[PDB]
Design a protein around this ligand. Structure first.
Ligand SMILES: O=C(Cc1cncc2ccccc12)N(CCC1CCCCC1)Cc1cccs1
Ligand SMILES: O=C(Cc1cncc2ccccc12)N(CCC1CCCCC1)Cc1cccs1
Lengths: 304, 304
């Protein structure tokens, strides 16, 4: 029992973190096989960020201008290319610690673990989610760029995010491991507003199911609702619309607790309309939306 | 910017996790050098837990009754002893992945990372704190015993906790790596009530400092208070008394923000007396107490 914001063990990803320096800029790189993946803004100075032309800036760089350090040993760069907003630095040594891996592009509402790094060294691990506005509410300081987001399925590490940016609003933006930004963000130091940060309804429902499993049942009411009625209330409260795909995805949690999905929706509806009244659910005073139904099942079953 | 409940990278501790089986009971062990540390209740059946006499139960066990598996390879047990509530299983192979380590006994209010394990395999990592009542609010299922709590200082892993128990209240109890329980808990399946779970005031103040650094300043008021006046309010709200040692420990955060410790105490006092009014601080609707002043500084500075 007990329910925690849990991240995947970071060991497999720590073994991939390297330091990439280009000129006076230093950030993190991900070393998988004989390729080092890093944000392309490693080639920029702070002044360049206002209006960078990456292709032109890259012309003035050669393999030897990219310094890659794994531990206290330097890696030899034998090739370099730009794929969208990431640079692929081909090195002469395959990473002996390369885990089994995939590059996946996640959807909003999907959660992942981040291994925050500075100078190629891991400093911390936390769990977060891709917000519906395509931002992540991370914890990143200057130099954290190149830190990655990932999920683990037994032994396979699915890399889904690479950190690139902090918007003026203090939220974060980044790309998948192919260099494509999540959302409409660009790697320029320019006015970029995130968009409405809606609550991930399916994740809130999953977390309400986790609360019932773990004993917090005070919020359970005697009502039920329909998808349409529930969505009228969800829209008013800046909650994402709930689909039949979401109801289907909550099926196993519905079965384990004996609580139909639409009954849990009615309980959520009253929590939105009446507030918590100074009460908590799993030690939280707000409705948590950064646990997917898969995370709730994984944590409550004990997947290793 | 951004502030997250961050755990230490778990890699160094993942390399120590082994599976210990005795008879029909299986739990986790910590393999450091040629010794495997595990809860002594690995020798008990579910029936034995009601009234175990560990010394007598242990007499019927020999080195060969303890099965240690690291990965898919079995380790040879060449010696066994009971130190308080942990068993030390001497194996014939020193762990090739032993990090630099210490066994420390933490105080209440101190935070640590837990690598939750099942069958010697890591399943997740989260950050928690030793509560003032000596319980931990973890996330542990049956089979999680032997999972450890730790802190990392650069390359040294300080092991501070080993999971043993879940109290009827759903909270957790465990020992330091010498087998001594935190608090008055015993490894018996018997009625054990935790005691008042007070809020760690010094940690709440540290987190209020983190909020100011990260831009959430709405709670800052025009008042100040004294340690005695503040403590009269803190007692009423089940908050731990604040000492001059705590004020001293908050000095660097006070300096970085320009906010005197007693001014932050007055802000906290009004938050306790008036509530949040539907507002949040670092995306939380309650006052967070599981970040020490050291954690706030570490996260805000970027210690690797
Ligand atoms: O946002 C960052 C990094 C960053 C990330 N997370 C958190 C940050 C916190 C503080 C400062 C910076 C942070 N950029 C890079 C900073 C420069 C450092 C020197 C060399 C040239 C880049 C600016 C842009 C990238 C893309 C579009 S604007
Ligand atoms: O509390 C646990 C483990 C546990 C921990 N965290 C979470 C748990 C969740 C569910 C069940 C159990 C949990 N004990 C061990 C369970 C037995 C399993 C079979 C063999 C004999 C022991 C009972 C006691 C230990 C000390 C005093 S009473």
């Amino acid at each position: 029992s007990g329910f925690r914001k849990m991240a995947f063990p970071s060991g497999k990803v720590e073994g991939c973190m390297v330091q990439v320096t280009c000129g006076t800029t230093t950030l993190n790189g991900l070393w998988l096989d004989d390729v080092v993946y890093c944000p392309r803004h490693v080639i920029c100075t702070s002044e360049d960020m206002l209006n960078p032309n990456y292709e032109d800036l890259l012309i003035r760089k050669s393999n030897h201008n990219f310094l890659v350090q794994a531990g206290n040993v330097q890696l030899r760069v034998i090739g370099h290319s730009m794929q969208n907003c990431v640079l692929k630095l081909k090195v002469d040594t395959a990473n002996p610690k390369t885990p089994k891996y995939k590059f996946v592009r996640i959807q909003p509402g999907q959660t992942f673990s981040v291994l925050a790094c500075y100078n190629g060294s891991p400093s911390g691990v936390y769990q977060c989610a891709m917000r519906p506005n395509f931002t992540i509410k991370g914890s990143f300081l200057n130099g954290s760029c190149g830190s990655v987001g990932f999920n683990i399925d037994y032994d396979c590490v699915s890399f889904c995010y690479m950190h690139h940016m902090e918007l003026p609003t203090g939220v974060h933006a980044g790309t998948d491991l192919e260099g494509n930004f999540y959302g409409p963000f660009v790697d320029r130091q320019t006015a970029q507003a995130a968009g409405t940060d809606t609550t991930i309804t399916v994740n809130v429902l999953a977390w309400l199911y986790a609360a019932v499993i773990n004993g917090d049942r005070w919020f359970l009411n005697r009502f039920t609702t329909t998808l349409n009625d529930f969505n009228l209330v969800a829209m008013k409260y800046n909650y994402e619309p709930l689909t039949q795909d979401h109801v289907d995805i909550l099926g196993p949690l519905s079965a384990q607790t004996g609580i139909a999905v639409l009954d849990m929706c009615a309980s959520l509806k009253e929590l939105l309309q009446n507030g918590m009244n100074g009460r908590t659910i799993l030690g939280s005073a707000l409705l948590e939306d950064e646990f997917t139904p898969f995370d709730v099942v994984r944590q409550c079953s004990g997947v290793t």
